[PDB]
Amino acid sequence: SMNPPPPETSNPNKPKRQTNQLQYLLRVVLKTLWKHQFAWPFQQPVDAVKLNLPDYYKIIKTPMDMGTIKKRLENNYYWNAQECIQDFNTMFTNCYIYNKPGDDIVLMAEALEKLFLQKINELPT
Ligand SMILES: COc1cc(C(=O)N2CCC(N3CCN(C)CC3)CC2)ccc1Nc1ncc2c(n1)N(C1CCC1)c1ccccc1C(=O)N2C
């Protein structure tokens, strides 16, 4: 099987805007995660062909990655911050679903998730 197309990062039918919370998600949250030592597996869509994972997209039907989130934020694709937060959570949950508790990649995802929640909490009122 080929890889599926990546998640859309623009959509001419979907209203878009820029908000302070969305700017924070790009300039602080995504920036912080992107530079983390464990970011690399999450910086692009899972290439199931290259990784020899013929069953990845049989199991994961809602793929998401930080490369896609980054482009979405840069493109002002979202209407609200909870949409973007959901994309991060989808990415983490996918990792937990495909893999098993305690796996190397699961620990990496858990570390990133902890940091993500810290940065979200730090959003100034
Ligand atoms: C760019 O994408 C990758 C590069 C390489 C790689 O060959 N690399 C890593 C970078 C480079 N490093 C050199 C040393 N420096 C310090 C860091 C970079 C050495 C060369 C390997 C895998 C990559 N992609 C990837 N993307 C998502 C994954 C994943 N892999 N894994 C792997 C289990 C652990 C990761 C999985 C394996 C099986 C089933 C599921 C997953 C999974 O859930 N996720 C999230």
UniProtKB/Swiss-Prot annotation:
Q: Where is the cross-link described as Glycyl lysine isopeptide (Lys-Gly) (interchain with G-Cter in SUMO2)?
A: 58
Subcellular localization(s) per the UniProt record: Nucleus; Chromosome
Which residues are annotated as site, described as Acetylated histone binding? 99
Post-translationally, this protein is described as follows, namely: Phosphorylation by CK2 disrupt the intramolecular binding between the bromo domain 2 and the NPS region and promotes binding between the NPS and the BID regions, leading to activate the protein and promote binding to acetylated histones. In absence of phosphorylation, BRD4 does not localize to p53/TP53 target gene promoters, phosphorylation promoting recruitment to p53/TP53 target promoters.
Residue ranges of every copy of the Bromo domain listed in the record: 17-123
Q: In which tissues is it expressed?
A: Ubiquitously expressed.
Query: What is the top-level taxon of the source organism?
Result: Eukaryota
What does this gene product do?
Chromatin reader protein that recognizes and binds acetylated histones and plays a key role in transmission of epigenetic memory across cell divisions and transcription regulation. Remains associated with acetylated chromatin throughout the entire cell cycle and provides epigenetic memory for postmitotic G1 gene transcription by preserving acetylated chromatin status and maintaining high-order chromatin structure. During interphase, plays a key role in regulating the transcription of signal-inducible genes by associating with the P-TEFb complex and recruiting it to promoters.
User: What free text does the record give on domains?
Assistant: The NET domain mediates interaction with a number of chromatin proteins involved in transcription regulation (NSD3, JMJD6, CHD4, GLTSCR1 and ATAD5).
Share what the entry says about its subunit structure, partners included.
Interacts with p53/TP53; the interaction is direct. Interacts (via CTD region) with CDK9 and CCNT1, acting as an associated component of P-TEFb complex. Interacts with RELA (when acetylated at 'Lys-310'). Interacts (via NET domain) with NSD3, CHD4, BICRA and ATAD5. The interaction with BICRA bridges BRD4 to the GBAF complex. Interacts (via NET domain) with JMJD6 (via JmjC and N-terminal domains); the interaction is stronger in presence of ssRNA and recruits JMJD6 on distal enhancers. Interacts with NSD3. Interacts with NIPBL.
Q: Which disease is it linked to?
A: Cornelia de Lange syndrome 6: A form of Cornelia de Lange syndrome, a clinically heterogeneous developmental disorder associated with malformations affecting multiple systems. It is characterized by facial dysmorphisms, abnormal hands and feet, growth delay, cognitive retardation, hirsutism, gastroesophageal dysfunction and cardiac, ophthalmologic and genitourinary anomalies. CDLS6 inheritance is autosomal dominant. A chromosomal aberration involving BRD4 is found in a rare, aggressive, and lethal carcinoma arising in midline organs of young people. Translocation t(15;19)(q14;p13) with NUTM1 which produces a BRD4-NUTM1 fusion protein.
Q: Which family is this sequence assigned to?
A: Belongs to the BET family.
Additional notes on this entry: JQ1, a thieno-triazolo-1,4-diazepine derivative, and I-BET, a benzodiazepine derivative, have been tested on tumors with success. Treatment with GSK1210151A (I-BET151, a I-BET derivative) has strong effets on mixed lineage leukemia and promotes myeloid differentiation and leukemia stem-cell depletion.
Q: What protein is this chain from?
A: Bromodomain-containing protein 4
What organism is this sequence from? Homo sapiens
Q: What is the lineage of its organism?
A: Eukaryota, Metazoa, Chordata, Craniata, Vertebrata
Q: Identify the coding gene.
A: BRD4
Included stretch of the parent chain? 44 to 166 of 1362
